[PDB]
Design a binder for these strands. Structure first.
Ligand SMILES: [Zn+2]
Lengths: 245, 46, 201, 94, 121, 147
RNA sequence: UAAGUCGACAAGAAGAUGGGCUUGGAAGCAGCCAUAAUUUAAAGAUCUCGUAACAGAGCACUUGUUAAAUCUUAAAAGCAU
């Protein structure tokens, strides 16, 4: 029979309860920051359900008109506008920035049979991770120089984040003109082609979304800086220009 | 008001308070409810 | 308590004067607990209270703030008077600077109110008397306490003013005691937005 | 906070500046129907390289104009002042 | 030949506009592949099972080891780091972006029971 | 408050009637104008077809109504070739668990989702997720789905 | 339990859908049966009201604000009311 000291192999000792959504959602953001290269942070102001659907309706429509005939993976539906927990999403940054996995020493663990097997606890919800982020955050001025510090003001109030699977400037123009239009660089969709955009429900929903800052390859970027990235027709073509020189 | 030997909350607004306790008596336990005045109950007899 | 920790912002003009631990001799008691006379003077008037000695005031004159603290959080008597003494200072500060007001609404056909002087029953020279025609056979006249100003912008609207909240709100309850709101038509005297739920029929 | 009595609000701040944090929270308290009621709000974002002093602008329905610096006073202190003027108006109306 | 409806079947009562005819079924091959896998979610005598069901299971289970008898802790209750890596690639990225959506439904099913039970009390 | 009302009316049948009359005649809005204004919206549908409508009556008795596609239950039954029962309209199963009225194949399900995509408010929902929203409703109206 | 406990406060609480049956009417909420799904920060074919029936107000549920550095909630036991 299972002994008392036995711990499930898929449930190492965590720093705090894992059943609660507070910690279960922290494990998601920790992985979102690693698999999402291009991330835009917005601010939502008490948007309604129907308005949320309408706001997410223009993205899907606007992001379906991006030409991708090179047989590349179908990155047109993994782009979601997700409302995240600002408080628990603040710990996510710290975990990536201030926790080094390679600094954990493996220990012997008991399986169902009771035999001792070496194991290392490097999960984000471990007591070692919690201790690292806390001690690292003790220094205030040094944290401001890090990328996390350049985003600490952003993580205040309700925040809605847009997640792109890859850094495709084409996918940004289709999402940067529907959520933060600024002609002539990123003009809003036309009225005679996209009447759904200028609806009473949707139009009133886009006024409550403000793009305060953006994060790219783990680097803080100002609002004006995002325009420079979106201005590029494509990341691939940009490299060829330097080769001709 | 209803004087029971077993007073219980009958809604979320019912509160248990001990009133009329002073230097001369111990008071009674009351169930006071602003939402429904039918939930007013007392525990003990004068 | 979570309210006793909050500092007390002293607005411009308000001046707090903390006394010294004193004991008034009481022949009826063998030992009186020391107290501290606190005066809160300002534009509108001056209020005073005597707090227990175990309460300590960190009167910051530089930043114009004053935080309270007790000598033992484990005692029930010190935890209670900590939050209470803070709630009074908050009223004293916001009562001597801005002032406390109470609005009474008279609902019901035939309910009026006038502010007239009754020199016969004056408890202090110039006392104002609120005369209420609450469908009674006799007249209802109550002299305003010394320190309060009563006026009637409209016949069915009384406006009490004073620096002591306990005095203003206690006098408003005396007026409301004549006609307590009923749940069938809403007739009565409502104090400071008080409302009553009506019946279907 | 009571927002019904506020006509217009114009905030000019920099996101990266820590002082502007107070200005950002103020924008969140506004209700959702504030746009439908007719209130006008214009937000300006400063460059990151150089940051000017944050500016806060408020107007009540009585024509009064309030202007308070964001750096000196915190967010909690800003909420206090706006409620007082919003309160006296309510007592006056009644 | 996997669908009961062959090409050319008249789709009944599926047109509400005047100047058009009821839709006619198209070839099965043209239809998207996902339409053939979205149907994966549809879910004395007792004495007879006690003779065989109870016995056969004990035979196959081979209750001599304590590896297949583990609790099999649900994913919605695990703490293992999700298979996400930094700069792992678009393959690793997408493949890593699927387990986060599979954990989403796991916790979702847990809310139904908690809400359905909360409303029963 | 701009009250909203739900009423199922006929395609080209707009006039004071049990469905139309009492739904909005009492609130105050000028109904006769709504009857002649609904015909212009519904002039390409079979006469008598039921058409859900969410009329939003703003203050001052100004009414703006958004016509919607036929009910999903109305299409599943009409497409399943169910036997007409009481009231002259195809009735659903009395016991969805035990009884079965029709067998609607997946080739029909893929179509009822496209016509339900015409609504702008439902035009963003991918069709992959919409075909299973109707297969989930066929279990409550007693319709079985055959591959 | 600073990954903000607890209380309060602000908003949200999607869609197919007015589930089918039922009844003069039954639209989450007379009753009968079903109640796998879907999409979301979340959201029961519905827990407490409400309507002739709709509508409408809360809850479960979800985010934010304030704010605890031995200060959260429950069970049992001792002694009292
Ligand atoms: Zn009660």
């Amino acid at each position: 029979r299972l002994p008392d000291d036995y711990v499930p192999p898929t449930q190492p000792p965590s720093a705090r309860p894992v059943d609660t959504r507070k910690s279960q959602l922290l494990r998601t953001y920790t992985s979102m920051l690693r698999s999402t290269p291009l991330m835009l942070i917005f601010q939502h102001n008490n948007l309604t359900a129907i308005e949320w659907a309408a706001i997410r309706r223009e993205l899907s429509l606007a992001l379906s008109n991006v030409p991708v005939p090179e047989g590349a993976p179908d990155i047109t539906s993994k782009i979601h506008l997700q409302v995240v927990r600002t408080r628990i999403f603040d710990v996510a940054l710290k975990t990536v920035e201030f926790f080094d996995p390679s600094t954990v020493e493996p220990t012997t663990a008991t399986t169902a049979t009771g035999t001792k097997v070496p194991a290392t606890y490097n999960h984000d919800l471990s007591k070692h991770a919690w201790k690292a982020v806390k001690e690292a955050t003790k220094n205030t001025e040094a944290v401001e120089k890090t990328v996390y510090g350049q985003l600490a003001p952003l993580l205040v109030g309700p925040v809605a984040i847009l997640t792109l699977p890859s850094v495709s400037p084409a996918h940004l123009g289709a999402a940067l003109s529907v959520l933060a239009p600024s002609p002539p660089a990123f003009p809003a969709p036309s009225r005679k082609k996209n009447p759904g955009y200028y609806d009473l429900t949707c139009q009133s929903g886009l006024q409550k979304l403000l793009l305060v800052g953006g994060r790219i390859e783990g680097k803080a970027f100002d609002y004006d800086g995002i325009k420079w990235v979106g201005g590029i027709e494509n990341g691939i073509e940009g490299l060829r220009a330097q080769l001709v020189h | 008001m209803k004087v029971h030997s077993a007073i219980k909350k009958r809604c979320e607004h019912c509160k248990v308070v001990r009133r009329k306790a002073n230097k001369r008596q111990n008071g009674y336990l009351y169930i006071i409810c602003p939402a429904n005045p039918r939930h007013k109950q007392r525990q003990g007899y004068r | 308590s979570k309210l006793g920790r909050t500092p007390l912002s002293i607005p411009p003009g308000v001046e707090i004067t903390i006394g010294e631990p004193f004991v008034k001799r009481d022949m009826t008691q063998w030992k009186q607990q020391p107290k501290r006379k606190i005066t809160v003077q300002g534009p509108l008037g001056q209020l005073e209270m005597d707090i227990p000695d175990f309460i300590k005031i960190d009167h910051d004159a530089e930043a114009r703030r004053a935080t309270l603290s007790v000598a033992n959080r484990d005692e029930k008597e010190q935890r209670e008077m900590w939050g209470t003494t803070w709630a009074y200072l908050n009223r004293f500060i916001m009562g001597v600077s801005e002032g406390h007001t109470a609005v009474l609404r008279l609902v019901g056909i035939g309910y009026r109110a006038t502010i007239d002087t009754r020199p016969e029953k004056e408890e202090y020279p110039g006392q104002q008397f609120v005369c209420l025609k609450l469908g009674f056979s006799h007249p209802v006249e109550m002299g305003v306490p010394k320190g309060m100003k009563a006026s009637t912008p409209q016949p069915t609207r009384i406006l009490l003013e004073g620096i002591n909240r306990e005095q203003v709100m206690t006098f408003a309850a005396d007026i409301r005691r004549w006609r307590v709101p009923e749940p069938y038509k809403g007739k009565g005297i409502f104090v400071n937005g008080e409302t009553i739920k009506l019946k279907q029929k | 906070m009571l927002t019904r009595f506020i006509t217009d609000v114009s905030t000019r701040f920099n996101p990266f500046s820590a002082k502007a944090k107070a200005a950002r929270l103020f924008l969140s308290f506004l209700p959702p129907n504030a746009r439908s009621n007719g209130m006008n709000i214009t937000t300006q974002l400063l460059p990151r390289n150089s940051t000017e002093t944050p500016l806060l602008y408020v107007k009540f329905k009585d024509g009064k104009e309030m202007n308070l610096d964001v750096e000196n006073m915190g967010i909690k202190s800003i909420v206090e002042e706006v409620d007082r003027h919003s309160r006296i108006l309510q007592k006056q109306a009644d | 030949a996997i669908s009961s409806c062959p090409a050319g079947t008249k789709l009944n009562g599926l047109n509400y506009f005047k100047n058009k005819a009821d839709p006619v079924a198209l070839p099965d091959e043209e239809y998207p592949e996902w339409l053939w896998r979205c149907l994966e979610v549809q879910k004395k005598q007792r004495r007879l099972a006690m003779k065989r069901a109870r016995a056969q299971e004990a035979k196959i289970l081979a209750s001599g080891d304590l590896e297949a008898l583990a609790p099999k802790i649900p994913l919605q209750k695990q703490s293992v780091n999700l298979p996400g890596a930094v700069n792992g690639g678009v393959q690793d990225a997408v493949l890593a972006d699927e387990k986060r959506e599979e954990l989403r439904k796991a916790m979702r099913k847990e809310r139904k029971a908690k809400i359905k039970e909360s409303n029963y009390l | 408050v701009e009250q909203v009302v739900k009423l199922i009316v006929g395609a080209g049948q707009a006039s004071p009637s049990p469905p139309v009359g009492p739904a909005l005649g009492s609130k105050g809005i000028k109904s006769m104008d709504f009857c002649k204004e609904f015909n212009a919206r519904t002039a390409h549908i079979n006469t008598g077809t039921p058409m859900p409508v969410r009329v939003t009556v703003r203050p001052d008795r100004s009414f703006h109504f958004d016509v919607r596609t036929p009910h999903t239950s109305w299409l599943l039954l009409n497409a399943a070739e169910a036997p007409i029962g009481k009231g002259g309209k195809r009735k659903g199963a009395s016991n969805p668990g035990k009884e079965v009225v029709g067998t609607v194949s997946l080739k029909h399900v893929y179509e009822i989702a496209k016509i339900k995509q015409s609504e702008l408010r439902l035009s963003g929902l991918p069709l992959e997720g919409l075909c299973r929203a109707v297969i989930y409703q066929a279990r409550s109206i007693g319709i079985n789905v055959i591959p």
